Amino acid sequence: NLWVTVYYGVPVWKDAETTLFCASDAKAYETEKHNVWATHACVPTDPNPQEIHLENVTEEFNMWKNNMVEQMHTDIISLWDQSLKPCVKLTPLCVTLQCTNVTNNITDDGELKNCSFNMTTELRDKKQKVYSLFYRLDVVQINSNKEYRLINCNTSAITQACPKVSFEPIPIHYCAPAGFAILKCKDKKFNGTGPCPSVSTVQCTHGIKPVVSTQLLLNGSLAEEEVMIRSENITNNAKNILVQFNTPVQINCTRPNNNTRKSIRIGPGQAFYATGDIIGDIRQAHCNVSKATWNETLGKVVKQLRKHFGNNTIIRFANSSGGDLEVTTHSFNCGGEFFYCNTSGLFNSTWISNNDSITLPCRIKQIINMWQRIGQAMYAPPIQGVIRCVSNITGLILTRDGGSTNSTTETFRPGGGDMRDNWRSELYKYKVVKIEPLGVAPTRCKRRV
């Protein structure tokens, strides 16, 4: 006759969620510079990131309902303002601006303006007459010479992230406390849904740069064997679809203009870092990508789509549809500055079944509302000189078209813009559970009288 018997510390866990915590290691912590991007209070990473494998455990993984993303989504926004609050508020910068088409010899059909405006000084009585050079996307005109005003003036209070704090993405390892853990799904071909064959537990993730970017993923994790195709539901065109490379892709992003930073005193303790006149040749931002590995990438990809879609079909690439500039173009911070690039010729293709490189135009925008939250904007101070950043492309986000013509051709374009998809890139293999160390199972045992 069986009884009940209690066992403490049994390998029984249940699925739950709680608050996690960052690990930036120690090396990007030394970047300092008065709170470079994230790392300030961040906990160090484990020197030996112990990864323990569990056997005979069939665990069902979902990256799309994974809660660790929404946390990462909010922290980056809060940490963003945590920089801007001690930083310089640019709310007084909303002013009538007398600007001119920038100095060049014709051959246009500008976008840079020599902007003279009446400003204020640290001494509250006396005022300031200054000039600065602004990109066309941060201002708008108002209706003698044309007058201009900032774009955020009628929307949200503008601040400026002080030049000490940087935007540079720093690898972050999210960790879990006791009574909980993190599970890493290591199986090579994994679509992110359903059960996960390879289940291993860790207390912290790998290095994850919270890259603030759109249309392209940089510096992240690479896939294995075939390039993996992951989507929550592929029958819905609206749901975004994420990909992971087995081969990293090189890109060289540059701002070729040699900038000057004019620091003007709005204080005491306040001040504004303006843009000075370009020194020498007038060029424009751009990034280069190899066309050869690119063409082969689309060939290795199109062979992977023909497992899920058709054995032999047609695949066409076309440029984007419409939306905010943060979607329709590629956003990211290159070292101090936020670039917005035209992506067209990458996606000029039509594929069916069976030496040089490329180049893309780019634009820089300083005032940024990113994550769209109104009432508070931010201004990115200009960085002195030629900016260069090299990135490695580990991931993608795409959407599909619509019924069109029956079993004819499917078209694909860029997509996303919700940064929750950015964090799904490194979190696809992760999820959280909770331990139930108490258990009751029968046996012939019985306690005393």
Binding site: W3, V4, Y8, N56, S78, A178, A441, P442, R444, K446
Partner: protein, 126 residues
């Protein structure tokens, strides 16, 4: 042999009773954005002491193992001893018993240590 934390999970329960000193040893693990890490480690001692409370109010309070004077209702997963410990993992098992757990627990806290421990003083007064 040391397989680490939660090593025997998918293993059968009879094989999973050897790691109890592991999973119970690391169970306690010994401004803005700083609040992020602090509230996380609090939930461990609540989850730990709640078991200690349950283990305490039952006839156990001793770690890693215990028994009881409460019989096993055959309505609770009627199975042979080998169909349970040898044939079932703690994951597959606790799946079945999550039904009557508190029904079981009620007799452990009340029919046992509320009762059997009252038997002490009545026997220990003389």
């Amino acid at each position: 042999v040391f397989l680490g934390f939660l090593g025997a999970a998918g293993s059968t329960m009879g094989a999973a009773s050897m790691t109890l000193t592991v999973q119970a040893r690391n169970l306690l693990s010994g401004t803005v954005w700083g609040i992020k890490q602090l509230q996380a480690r609090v939930l461990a001692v609540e989850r730990y002491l709640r078991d200690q409370q349950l283990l305490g109010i039952w006839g156990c309070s001793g770690k890693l193992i215990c028994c009881t004077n409460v019989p096993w209702n055959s309505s609770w997963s009627n199975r042979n001893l080998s169909e349970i410990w040898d044939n079932m993992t703690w994951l597959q098992w606790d799946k079945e018993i999550s039904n009557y757990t508190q029904i079981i627990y009620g007799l452990l806290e009340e029919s046992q240590n509320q009762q059997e421990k009252n038997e002490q003083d009545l026997l220990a007064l003389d």
